[PDB]
Amino acid sequence: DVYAQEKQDFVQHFSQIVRVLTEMGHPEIGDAIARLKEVLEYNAIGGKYNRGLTVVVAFRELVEPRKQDADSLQRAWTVGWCVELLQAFFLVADDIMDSSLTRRGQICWYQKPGVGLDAINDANLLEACIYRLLKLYCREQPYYLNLIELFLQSSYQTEIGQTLDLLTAPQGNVDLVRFTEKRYKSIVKYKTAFYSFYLPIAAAMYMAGIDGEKEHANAKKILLEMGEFFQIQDDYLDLFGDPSVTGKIGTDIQDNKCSWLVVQCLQRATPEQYQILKENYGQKEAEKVARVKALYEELDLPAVFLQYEEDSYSHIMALIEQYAAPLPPAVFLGLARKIYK
Amino acid sequence: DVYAQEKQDFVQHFSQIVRVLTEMGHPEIGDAIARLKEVLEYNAIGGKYNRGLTVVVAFRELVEPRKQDADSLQRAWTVGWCVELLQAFFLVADDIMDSSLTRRGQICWYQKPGVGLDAINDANLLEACIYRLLKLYCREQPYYLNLIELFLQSSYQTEIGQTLDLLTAPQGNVDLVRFTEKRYKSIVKYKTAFYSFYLPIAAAMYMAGIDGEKEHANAKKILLEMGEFFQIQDDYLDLFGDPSVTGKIGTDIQDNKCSWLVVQCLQRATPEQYQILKENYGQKEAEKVARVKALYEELDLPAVFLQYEEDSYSHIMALIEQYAAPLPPAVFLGLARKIYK
Ligand SMILES: O=P(O)(O)C(Nc1ncnc2sc(-c3ccc([C@@H]4CC4(F)F)cc3)cc12)P(=O)(O)O
Ligand SMILES: O=P(O)(O)C(Nc1ncnc2sc(-c3ccc([C@@H]4CC4(F)F)cc3)cc12)P(=O)(O)O
Ligand SMILES: O=P(O)(O)C(Nc1ncnc2sc(-c3ccc([C@@H]4CC4(F)F)cc3)cc12)P(=O)(O)O
Ligand SMILES: O=P(O)(O)C(Nc1ncnc2sc(-c3ccc([C@@H]4CC4(F)F)cc3)cc12)P(=O)(O)O
């Protein structure tokens, strides 16, 4: 299991990441750096690390082993951690915006006592640490500027998607008319697919000298289609998954979210079916949640998902056959096997 | 008035800034871009634009007029606007953290109805726009990477200071023991001086080919000492200024802030004077505010400020005489004349 082999060394490298981001020439800022230590430890640790590890795995698959020295690996781990800090920045902030209670089975940072909206500044420091790391480890490298720009573009794309999400589903203002498929695909593309699929692979490519605009265009065609499928999967499993399988528990309906399900549900309705969803979707009560689930069931939406999963598997295989070269197909396929739940 | 000459053209260029940051190949994100237009217009417009204009004025003073073509000026205006967007990013967010009501005599963005904590994402888009602008206007230039890194370093330094501020004065937890001078100088240095004084001049230098580590070290020695003085000035004027002069009205005492005044006040106290400040500083009531002001008065703190202003003027002149070369002294002096209130 190629990801499980690399994990040990990756998660150990965190010690050094934090040591270096807090390494004492200016004793005056001690107290803020301490706080920075605390923010990293609480927010970068505890996930599965899929995105970060994809950098280290791709790097191994993309570089000639002759050219995989100790330095090269330190940089790969670091850039991997950069991806993880990006995620930490987004999540700290999104949890504030969504009024979330927990994240990874523990209290969101901003809910922790004495933190509150100070978390906004903490999220910003998380983003800042990316560019500090890139500079400490990669300034002298020929791909240095490509990475800076790739992280920046990835932040912008994610923010644009978050904006589009916030527009599509305002807390307190339940409206289903703007839960369209065109709109769903866009949110997923910008809000998750880009930084979760494209970014880690693309960081790997750059680090191995692969900076062709055509090569990157091709990786991206594949990786976006992948990330779309994997988000639709999570939406499905949110409801119809056993929570032993998932790890979450499915609040998408109480939270009035733009899930793939409710979208597809919306397309397959006599006018009278809409009124039941208007009535039930978003409410605290549990009997209400049940009537929504029963509804999606009586529209054989599993059958619709199953069909989507077939077609999607076929298309992605085709893409990989057509556009992976000159990359090894196992960079894409290994990712798919790792994220499939 | 060198700043008043450049203002017209600078503020007109905003039209183009916004046109370009919202310029339609991807119709799917229309709705988020619209929102981006709205965020820029509300948050980048309405200030004095000192920081932004310092880029355009310095550029004129630093480049040989032969080499000040139409392109060169577009880039100067743009980078100026980049500074202004940085400010917009910080202020949108700081207003959330401080639970501010108004900013520039109007409702803070996050208080505007339908915005709320969505403003966090909006602040982030403001930061993102800097790097989009830098790329659209400067990618091909030899100073491109220096600007990217300068903006990033400036964000980090500001955030670190904001962290140190948040630590020093927690809303709800009034403690004066950590309002020390060493701590005050640090907050000002990182939170304001760097990005308000050093950054705009340094962006100008880079754009004119001045990338020496020694030249930048020297500009910075001057500009930090300047920014320190100008913040101490604002603290003073917050209380002892006529508000016809200032434009603000002095809430620093109700808001339990780490002002230069309260700091210096703390150093000049029998133990019994502290108890009056413990008692009065931070409270809603007005009679309480008065007893604080009366206190600072009876410690001849104007006399202490006056002395500080003399010594400070002398030191800054000395710095400029010693370290401005090979820059023209009028870049520093013009800045001082523009910001002195
Ligand atoms: O037990 P499930 O996972 O629910 C089962 N699924 C499968 N069963 C046997 N082979 C495959 S191969 C496969 C699959 C793998 C990857 C992908 C997407 C393309 C990718 F890799 F991104 C899509 C479908 C699913 C799949 P079903 O729901 O089809 O009954
Ligand atoms: O009886 P098999 O079909 O061979 C069964 N397979 C599965 N069963 C229930 N869900 C999934 S999902 C799945 C799967 C996931 C990803 C992929 C493709 C390689 C990749 F990860 F892109 C192919 C198949 C297989 C798979 P087994 O492998 O446990 O024997
Ligand atoms: O009417 P105020 O402004 O209050 C008056 N101030 C001055 N009066 C006549 N010349 C100068 S030159 C001067 C000054 C200018 C710049 C600076 C700081 C160095 C810098 F430029 F950054 C410090 C002091 C103040 C100053 P006072 O408070 O000293 O009575
Ligand atoms: O009677 P003057 O001393 O000549 C009087 N000057 C001032 N009066 C009250 N506040 C200030 S603050 C001030 C000032 C500010 C900045 C500077 C130095 C050049 C710089 F902006 F660094 C020098 C003096 C002069 C100044 P005027 O200029 O209106 O005639």
Side-chain angles (χ1 to χ4, degrees), chain A residues 2-7 9-23 25-47 49-63 65 67-181 183-247 249-255 257-265 267-276 280-283 286-290 292-295 297 299-320 322-336 338-340, chain B residues 2-7 9-23 25-47 49-63 65 67-181 183-247 249-255 257-265 267-276 280-283 286-290 292-295 297 299-320 322-336 338-340:
Chain A
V2 72
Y3 281 76
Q5 289 188 356
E6 305 287 314
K7 188 155 152 168
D9 291 320
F10 179 72
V11 180
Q12 284 170 302
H13 183 72
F14 190 72
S15 264
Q16 203 200 314
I17 295 287
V18 161
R19 175 161 45 247
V20 180
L21 289 181
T22 79
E23 252 200 283
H26 312 316
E28 62 196 333
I29 57 168
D31 290 8
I33 295 298
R35 163 68 174 236
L36 174 57
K37 188 152 137 57
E38 185 180 17
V39 167
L40 286 165
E41 288 179 320
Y42 193 97
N43 292 292
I45 297 293
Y49 309 107
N50 286 330
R51 295 175 188 72
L53 276 183
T54 290
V55 169
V56 187
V57 153
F59 170 86
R60 285 198 177 277
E61 293 178 287
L62 281 167
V63 177
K67 281 196 284 178
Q68 282 168 44
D69 82 304
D71 279 8
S72 259
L73 273 163
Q74 282 264 309
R75 299 203 282 282
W77 296 329
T78 291
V79 168
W81 271 108
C82 289
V83 179
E84 289 300 310
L85 293 175
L86 192 76
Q87 169 85 318
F89 156 71
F90 293 140
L91 291 187
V92 164
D94 291 340
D95 280 337
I96 302 169
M97 290 182 267
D98 298 314
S99 293
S100 301
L101 297 171
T102 63
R103 152 76 63 192
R104 298 162 183 177
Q106 60 189 20
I107 285 152
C108 298
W109 181 237
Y110 86 99
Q111 291 280 7
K112 186 171 162 306
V115 176
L117 298 182
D118 294 358
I120 293 156
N121 164 71
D122 300 319
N124 286 325
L125 286 167
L126 291 173
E127 157 180 65
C129 281
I130 298 157
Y131 303 100
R132 289 188 65 223
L133 286 177
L134 289 183
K135 196 213 190 166
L136 280 146
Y137 283 93
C138 306
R139 53 177 189 284
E140 304 291 299
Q141 295 297 312
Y143 55 71
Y144 177 51
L145 180 61
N146 287 319
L147 288 186
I148 285 168
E149 290 189 336
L150 173 69
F151 277 93
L152 295 169
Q153 193 192 17
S154 292
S155 305
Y156 174 67
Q157 300 264 311
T158 295
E159 290 159 6
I160 269 291
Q162 173 66 353
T163 300
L164 203 55
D165 191 42
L166 292 175
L167 298 175
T168 311
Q171 297 208 321
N173 196 48
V174 57
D175 200 319
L176 302 162
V177 151
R178 56 213 174 184
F179 286 8
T180 73
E181 170 137 54
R183 178 50 71 73
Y184 181 80
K185 292 203 181 208
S186 270
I187 293 181
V188 170
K189 190 188 180 208
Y190 286 85
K191 189 181 168 177
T192 61
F194 198 107
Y195 88 94
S196 295
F197 286 77
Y198 177 75
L199 159 65
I201 299 296
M205 295 169 59
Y206 283 123
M207 284 170 92
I210 314 180
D211 48 301
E213 297 159 56
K214 186 80 221 86
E215 292 98 78
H216 278 274
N218 286 338
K220 190 185 298 191
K221 188 142 150 69
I222 292 167
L223 286 159
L224 295 179
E225 191 60 81
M226 275 189 30
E228 170 160 291
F229 169 80
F230 283 111
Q231 189 54 57
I232 295 169
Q233 180 178 176
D234 303 336
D235 288 0
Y236 189 83
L237 287 170
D238 195 81
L239 184 56
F240 287 116
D242 189 291
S244 314
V245 173
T246 36
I249 301 177
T251 53
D252 279 359
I253 293 186
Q254 301 98 299
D255 299 351
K257 291 197 198 293
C258 190
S259 160
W260 184 77
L261 292 150
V262 76
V263 167
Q264 282 288 315
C265 179
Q267 291 167 45
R268 288 178 176 65
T270 42
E272 71 258 347
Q273 288 176 333
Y274 178 61
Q275 291 305 306
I276 288 172
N280 288 291
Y281 202 91
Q283 294 293 297
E287 82 179 3
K288 292 179 155 58
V289 172
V292 179
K293 173 167 184 159
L295 175 49
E297 282 193 351
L299 299 155
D300 306 4
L301 279 186
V304 180
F305 175 56
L306 209 45
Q307 181 67 64
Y308 168 72
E309 180 177 56
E310 293 158 44
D311 292 345
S312 181
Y313 175 76
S314 290
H315 181 54
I316 300 249
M317 290 307 133
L319 301 179
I320 285 170
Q322 174 177 343
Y323 296 102
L327 289 75
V331 302
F332 301 102
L333 297 166
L335 185 51
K338 189 55 172 75
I339 291 188
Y340 198 100
Chain B
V2 72
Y3 281 76
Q5 289 188 356
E6 305 287 314
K7 188 155 152 168
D9 291 320
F10 179 72
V11 180
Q12 284 170 302
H13 183 72
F14 190 72
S15 264
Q16 203 200 314
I17 295 287
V18 161
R19 175 161 45 247
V20 180
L21 289 181
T22 79
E23 252 200 283
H26 312 316
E28 62 196 333
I29 57 168
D31 290 8
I33 295 298
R35 163 68 174 236
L36 174 57
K37 188 152 137 57
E38 185 180 17
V39 167
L40 286 165
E41 288 179 320
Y42 193 97
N43 292 292
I45 297 293
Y49 309 107
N50 286 330
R51 295 175 188 72
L53 276 183
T54 290
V55 169
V56 187
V57 153
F59 170 86
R60 285 198 177 277
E61 293 178 287
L62 281 167
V63 177
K67 281 196 284 178
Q68 282 168 44
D69 82 304
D71 279 8
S72 259
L73 273 163
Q74 282 264 309
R75 299 203 282 282
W77 296 329
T78 291
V79 168
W81 271 108
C82 289
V83 179
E84 289 300 310
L85 293 175
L86 192 76
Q87 169 85 318
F89 156 71
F90 293 140
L91 291 187
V92 164
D94 291 340
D95 280 337
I96 302 169
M97 290 182 267
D98 298 314
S99 293
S100 301
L101 297 171
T102 63
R103 152 76 63 192
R104 298 162 183 177
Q106 60 189 20
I107 285 152
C108 298
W109 181 237
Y110 86 99
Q111 291 280 7
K112 186 171 162 306
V115 176
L117 298 182
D118 294 358
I120 293 156
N121 164 71
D122 300 319
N124 286 325
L125 286 167
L126 291 173
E127 157 180 65
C129 281
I130 298 157
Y131 303 100
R132 289 188 65 223
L133 286 177
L134 289 183
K135 196 213 190 166
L136 280 146
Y137 283 93
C138 306
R139 53 177 189 284
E140 304 291 299
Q141 295 297 312
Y143 55 71
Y144 177 51
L145 180 61
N146 287 319
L147 288 186
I148 285 168
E149 290 189 336
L150 173 69
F151 277 93
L152 295 169
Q153 193 192 17
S154 292
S155 305
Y156 174 67
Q157 300 264 311
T158 295
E159 290 159 6
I160 269 291
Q162 173 66 353
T163 300
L164 203 55
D165 191 42
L166 292 175
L167 298 175
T168 311
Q171 297 208 321
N173 196 48
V174 57
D175 200 319
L176 302 162
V177 151
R178 56 213 174 184
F179 286 8
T180 73
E181 170 137 54
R183 178 50 71 73
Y184 181 80
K185 292 203 181 208
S186 270
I187 293 181
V188 170
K189 190 188 180 208
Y190 286 85
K191 189 181 168 177
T192 61
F194 198 107
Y195 88 94
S196 295
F197 286 77
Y198 177 75
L199 159 65
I201 299 296
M205 295 169 59
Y206 283 123
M207 284 170 92
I210 314 180
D211 48 301
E213 297 159 56
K214 186 80 221 86
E215 292 98 78
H216 278 274
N218 286 338
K220 190 185 298 191
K221 188 142 150 69
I222 292 167
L223 286 159
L224 295 179
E225 191 60 81
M226 275 189 30
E228 170 160 291
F229 169 80
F230 283 111
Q231 189 54 57
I232 295 169
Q233 180 178 176
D234 303 336
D235 288 0
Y236 189 83
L237 287 170
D238 195 81
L239 184 56
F240 287 116
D242 189 291
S244 314
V245 173
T246 36
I249 301 177
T251 53
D252 279 359
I253 293 186
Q254 301 98 299
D255 299 351
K257 291 197 198 293
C258 190
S259 160
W260 184 77
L261 292 150
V262 76
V263 167
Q264 282 288 315
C265 179
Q267 291 167 45
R268 288 178 176 65
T270 42
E272 71 258 347
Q273 288 176 333
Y274 178 61
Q275 291 305 306
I276 288 172
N280 288 291
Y281 202 91
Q283 294 293 297
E287 82 179 3
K288 292 179 155 58
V289 172
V292 179
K293 173 167 184 159
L295 175 49
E297 282 193 351
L299 299 155
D300 306 4
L301 279 186
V304 180
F305 175 56
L306 209 45
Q307 181 67 64
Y308 168 72
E309 180 177 56
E310 293 158 44
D311 292 345
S312 181
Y313 175 76
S314 290
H315 181 54
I316 300 249
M317 290 307 133
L319 301 179
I320 285 170
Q322 174 177 343
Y323 296 102
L327 289 75
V331 302
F332 301 102
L333 297 166
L335 185 51
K338 189 55 172 75
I339 291 188
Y340 198 100

